Amino acid sequence: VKVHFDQAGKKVSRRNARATRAAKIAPRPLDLLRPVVRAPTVKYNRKVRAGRGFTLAEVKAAGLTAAYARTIGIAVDHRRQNRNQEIFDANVQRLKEYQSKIIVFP
Amino acid sequence: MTSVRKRKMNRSSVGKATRRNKDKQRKINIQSNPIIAANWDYSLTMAQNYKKLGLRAKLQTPAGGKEADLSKVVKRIPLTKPVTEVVKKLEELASRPVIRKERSQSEREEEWLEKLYKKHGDDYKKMFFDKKLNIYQQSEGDLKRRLLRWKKRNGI
Amino acid sequence: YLWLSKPPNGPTIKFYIQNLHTMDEXXXXXXXXXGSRPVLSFDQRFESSPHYQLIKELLVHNFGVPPXXXXXXXXXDHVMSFSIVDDKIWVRTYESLVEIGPRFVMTVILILEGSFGGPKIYENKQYVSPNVVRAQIKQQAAEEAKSRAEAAVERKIKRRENVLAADPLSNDALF
Amino acid sequence: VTSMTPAPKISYKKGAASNRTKFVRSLVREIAGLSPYERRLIDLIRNSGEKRARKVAKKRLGSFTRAKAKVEEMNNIIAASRRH
RNA sequence: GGACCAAGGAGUCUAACGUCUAUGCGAGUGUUUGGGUGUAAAACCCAUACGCGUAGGUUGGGGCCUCGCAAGAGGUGCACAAUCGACCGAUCCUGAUGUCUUCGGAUGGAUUUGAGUAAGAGCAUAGCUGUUGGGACCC
RNA sequence: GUUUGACCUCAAAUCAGGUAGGAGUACCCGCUGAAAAGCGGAGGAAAAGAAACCAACCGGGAUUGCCUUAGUAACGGCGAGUGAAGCGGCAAAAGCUCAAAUUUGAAAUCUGGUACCUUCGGUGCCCGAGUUGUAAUUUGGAGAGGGCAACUUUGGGGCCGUUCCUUGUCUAUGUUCCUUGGAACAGGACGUCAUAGAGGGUGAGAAUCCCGUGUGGCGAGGAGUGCGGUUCUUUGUAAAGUGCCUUCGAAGAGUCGAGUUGUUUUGCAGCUCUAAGUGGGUGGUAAAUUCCAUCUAAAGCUAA
């Protein structure tokens, strides 16, 4: 037996985390740059979704290295495979738009 | 307050090691850039304050509803009835070139290049197959790169 | 699934298995002498259908027991019965008869040539593999979700297209 | 929704065997000699044929395709030793 | 079953189905896992999902209309009921046009069938209650 | 050479330096186990955790936790009832390190002692450890050697702020008249403050009596690299990254697996047997002498 009495409280604490982390990460977003990825499982195969990370080859197609891209806040998954054209292209456009909107301090 | 420890610590002459924290955990300093530390407000939120900056706070797709906060009046559809600033400051700062230093050359190896420059002159196929003063057997073009850097540094 | 086949020869049959019952429960409640000569009970024609006739033949060759069986000096009244119900062979085991054995509901799938590879010669279309049943379940669920999403779209349309305009004679119409 | 061909990632284990590792394994083979059931197994080939040899080897092993490779390997040993 | 007296002292809570009633919306309904917000365990706003549901005739007959001063007469007929239908699914025969020699179901029958079609009613919350289980009125 | 010495092993040290135990034990992790108890081991969390994964799709992508899946699948004298998981939505997000081929043009590595120094350390010197392998480089997402073309990059301190902690101090307005009362903090009349009318005390219900409360301010002592300025230096043929070309291009065995026994509801354990390298694991698939999918086990760490 357990009752979530702290449901109101923990959220507050969580936003405190979402405050406090943000304090350290002051210009940058809290979250990384995640891929837009179409789901499996025919019930959901029309659904698109947030994915974990893009790939090496896609980040190369964006025009940078993944080792550098992790410093730019772009989530990268090696074990994913890009197999759909439109997914790949839309995520490349996403990467380009993310590159357009950042300004990086030396 | 019914453990033996808590009751003894209550009855003790030591007094509780009491520290107050709950007020100061809500407020945070941003610690990182003095520009954001200037424009930070401590009143709006992380979210509202990043929006008032112009920086995208969360990347993508917030769960829940944002504040559309009544900027405009929305009127009913008749259905055809019958008859930036701080962004600019940080953009200048990232656009500001840092005072950089040219990577120079070390005195021994530029002297080595100076020996090669007088021994062979400028040609590279002779100095590539030189035993004395090319004992590390430098690459054909690394020789060119170091000599061009040395010439731009000294001796045209 | 099982195969039973003559390993230098053309026969090869694939049967599906349903509804097993074991020796553990009281459905048997008796043991017999392991090695007695079996009797069969072909509770079906097994004659008019040539492939069922081959099934009956190969079950005779398979389940026929030569006298090299140990403990065959006793006959333990051992009998096994085969019964095509619709196209499923119910197989039972008796020892007056008491069910002393495991229980089958068995299903033909396909017949092919050779010893394990040779070309497919016969197949009953009446069998459905249960993977296809699960696939039907998932496809029907995906169709339901598609219809539910389209209906939610049309509900938001009808909510947008549900608004009735004000009368020209109302206070909000004036002001 | 039309196509895109990924570059197929094959593990380096699945590539091939090197000259180095074949040399290593074969050089271990003559040094290690035979285990005693292998000493039995070469004799059992020579006496009662590869049928009974494969059956005894599968009994020593767990599976059958390993017994194939074991019998074939001892045939390679007999071919390497007796003719040469 | 009892010397007396004071105080304490025995159908509570929860979960799952069920009826009824009230309330909101309605073929839809359900904010509160979570996010945003805040005067801060309150209130306020809500993205994507998810849950459950949705996807003919005759006889009457509430009324209503007409006429009738009225009594009554005529007409249209809510809900619902009965009949005769129809159709779908099943049922057991017919077994065509075709037919790979065993495939096929065309047509016509037959009874019942079914919270069947023949123009929805549900979802959510609360209350009171029924059954079951948690120690389950107490000893 | 009956001598002497390398080792190697094993002892001894009131030799030097360290460390283990016990308590507590809500949460965690192992072992044992009835009709829980017990044992062992930790921490502020622990565990788990970067696929020998899930799937069959238009594929997904470490672990963890919540809602849903769902009281479903499945199991069960299919009786009692037992009872999942994929996907989806969310919270949170983070990835890395070994072991395989030579640095052979120089073991480049480290403990310890000592002398100094700016001391959670640094430098020097000397014993040792170590080739039966300590460093650099490389963990498949490859990588390495070169070569070409370019570009692109540099590290270490200080100090002062800032940030964090622990404190210290300052920061409003009636004690105005009357009645009652032992005592006004009660009642009436007239007021003032307020970003302060929370709370408490003061001889009865006190915003205004006191402490506070509220708003801000000034300190003090630490922690610290989080960043922000200054300031001092840092190169030595030093280190790295990207594209192209050329030449190569090595990985977890008493393990996998098999049988049996116990145990659990398929793993685990014991006993016996015991592999492969275009290998192996796992799952669908068949118009069938099938094709295709998907990972790399038997080494390790990792916040939330």
Curated annotation (Swiss-Prot), chain A:
The keyword Plastid does not apply. One of its GO terms (biological process) is cytoplasmic translation. It is found in: Cytoplasm. The keyword Cytoplasm applies. Keywords: Cytoplasm, Phosphoprotein, Ribonucleoprotein, Ribosomal protein. It comes from the Eukaryota. One of its GO terms (molecular function) is RNA binding. Belongs to the eukaryotic ribosomal protein eL13 family. Component of the large ribosomal subunit (LSU). Mature yeast ribosomes consist of a small (40S) and a large (60S) subunit. The 40S small subunit contains 1 molecule of ribosomal RNA (18S rRNA) and 33 different proteins (encoded by 57 genes). The large 60S subunit contains 3 rRNA molecules (25S, 5.8S and 5S rRNA) and 46 different proteins (encoded by 81 genes). Component of the ribosome, a large ribonucleoprotein complex responsible for the synthesis of proteins in the cell. The small ribosomal subunit (SSU) binds messenger RNAs (mRNAs) and translates the encoded message by selecting cognate aminoacyl-transfer RNA (tRNA) molecules. The large subunit (LSU) contains the ribosomal catalytic site termed the peptidyl transferase center (PTC), which catalyzes the formation of peptide bonds, thereby polymerizing the amino acids delivered by tRNAs into a polypeptide chain. This is Large ribosomal subunit protein eL13A. The lineage of its organism: Eukaryota, Fungi, Dikarya, Ascomycota, Saccharomycotina. The gene is RPL13A.
Curated annotation (Swiss-Prot), chain B:
It is found in: Nucleus, Nucleolus. Its main location: nucleus. It comes from the Eukaryota. Residues 1-10, 17-27 have a biased composition (Basic residues). Disulfide bonds: none annotated. The keyword Cytoplasm does not apply. Keywords: Nucleus, Phosphoprotein, Ribonucleoprotein, Ribosome biogenesis, rRNA processing. GO terms for cellular component: nucleolus; nucleus; preribosome, large subunit precursor. Residues 1-30 are annotated as: Disordered. The modification Phosphoserine is found at residues 104, 106. Coiled coil: none annotated. GO terms for biological process: ribosomal large subunit biogenesis; rRNA processing. Present with 2860 molecules/cell in log phase SD medium. Belongs to the NOP16 family. Involved in the biogenesis of the 60S ribosomal subunit. Component of the pre-66S ribosomal particle. Interacts with NOP7, RRP1 and RRP15. This is Nucleolar protein 16. The gene is NOP16.
UniProtKB/Swiss-Prot annotation, chain D:
It is found in: Cytoplasm. GO terms for cellular component: cytosol; cytosolic large ribosomal subunit. Component of the large ribosomal subunit (LSU). Mature yeast ribosomes consist of a small (40S) and a large (60S) subunit. The 40S small subunit contains 1 molecule of ribosomal RNA (18S rRNA) and 33 different proteins (encoded by 57 genes). The large 60S subunit contains 3 rRNA molecules (25S, 5.8S and 5S rRNA) and 46 different proteins (encoded by 81 genes). N-terminally acetylated by acetyltransferase NatA. Component of the ribosome, a large ribonucleoprotein complex responsible for the synthesis of proteins in the cell. The small ribosomal subunit (SSU) binds messenger RNAs (mRNAs) and translates the encoded message by selecting cognate aminoacyl-transfer RNA (tRNA) molecules. The large subunit (LSU) contains the ribosomal catalytic site termed the peptidyl transferase center (PTC), which catalyzes the formation of peptide bonds, thereby polymerizing the amino acids delivered by tRNAs into a polypeptide chain. It comes from Saccharomyces cerevisiae (strain ATCC 204508 / S288c) (Baker's yeast). Keywords: Acetylation, Cytoplasm, Ribonucleoprotein, Ribosomal protein. GO terms for biological process: cytoplasmic translation. The lineage of its organism: Eukaryota, Fungi, Dikarya, Ascomycota, Saccharomycotina. It comes from the Eukaryota. The chain holds residues 17 to 100 of 100 of the full protein. This is Large ribosomal subunit protein eL36A. Belongs to the eukaryotic ribosomal protein eL36 family. GO terms for molecular function: RNA binding; structural constituent of ribosome. The keyword Ribonucleoprotein applies. Present with 31600 molecules/cell in log phase SD medium. There are 2 genes for eL36 in yeast.
